[PDB]
């Protein structure tokens, strides 16, 4: 897992995310959908959003990003002790939304990208390493729950 100092770095940059959860989520989704377009195909109501401005103007997308980042922020604040709130997330992502773990990696890449774009002075190498470890732990643990529910990563 992570050292206490690594968790502290994670929670330090997450409080910066929390000054604008909506805007970070929008930037993350726009990056994700651009970098990895197959990901958009999993979102039936965002597919008509053909341009960056349409994506930013969509309150449905903006709310979706806050919902995702809120759940992730709560997980990160448990500092690895997150079985109770990983279970429902794996349940829906595995059996309803059908999201491969590789897509969770794509979204992690977008998260790290946006964190650096917005907070370069507060997202240096040690903090980046910490966040990747924290997101890697999240993905590892949800991948195991995917298998417990059946059907692989």
> Binding site annotation covers 116?
no
Burial class (CB in 10 A: 0-12, 13-18, 19+), 71: middle
Among positions 39, 55, 62, 76, the unique one binding ligand HEM when judged by CB under 6 A: 39
Distances from the Cα of 142 to the Cα of 4, 17, 111, 145, 150, angstroms: 22, 23, 17, 5, 12
CA distance 116 to 97: 29
In the bound state with ligand HEM, the residue whose beta carbon lies nearer, of 39 and 58, is 39
Query: Does residue 71 belong to the site contacting ligand HEM (CB under 6 A)?
Result: yes
Least gap, CB of 68 to ligand HEM (angstroms): 4
Query: Does residue 86 belong to the site contacting ligand HEM (CB under 6 A)?
Result: no
Least gap, CB of 104 to ligand HEM (angstroms): 5
Query: Does residue 94 belong to the site contacting ligand HEM (CB under 6 A)?
Result: no
Query: Does residue 92 belong to the site contacting ligand HEM (CB under 6 A)?
Result: yes
Query: Does residue 115 belong to the site contacting ligand HEM (CB under 6 A)?
Result: no
Locus of tokens 């994506």: 55
Tokens standing for 64?
């979706």
Closest among 109, 104, 99, 95 to 43, alpha carbons compared: 99
> Binding site annotation covers 93?
yes
Helix 101-118 × helix 125-148 angle, to 10°: 160
* Residue ranges of the binding site: 64, 93
Which residues form the interface with ligand HEM (CB under 6 A)?
A: 39, 42-43, 64, 67-68, 71-72, 89, 92-93, 97, 99, 103-104, 107
* Residue ranges of the binding site for O2: 64
């Amino acid at each position: 897992v992570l050292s206490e100092g690594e968790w502290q770095l994670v929670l330090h940059v997450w409080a910066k995310v929390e000054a604008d959860v909506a805007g970070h989520g929008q930037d993350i989704h726009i990056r994700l959908f651009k970098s990895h377009p197959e990901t958009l195909e999993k979102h039936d109501r965002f597919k008509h959003l053909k341009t960056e401005a349409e994506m930013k103007a969509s309150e449905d997308l903006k709310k979706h990003g806050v919902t995702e980042l809120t759940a992730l922020g709560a997980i990160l604040k448990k500092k690895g002790h997150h079985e109770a709130e990983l279970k429902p997330l794996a349940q829906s992502h595995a059996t309803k939304h059908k999201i491969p773990i590789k897509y969770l990696e794509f979204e992690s890449e977008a998260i790290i990208h946006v964190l650096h774009s917005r907070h370069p002075g507060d997202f240096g190498a040690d903090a980046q390493g910490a966040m990747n470890k924290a997101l890697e732990l999240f993905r590892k643990d949800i991948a195991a729950k995917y298998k417990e529910l059946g059907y692989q990563g």
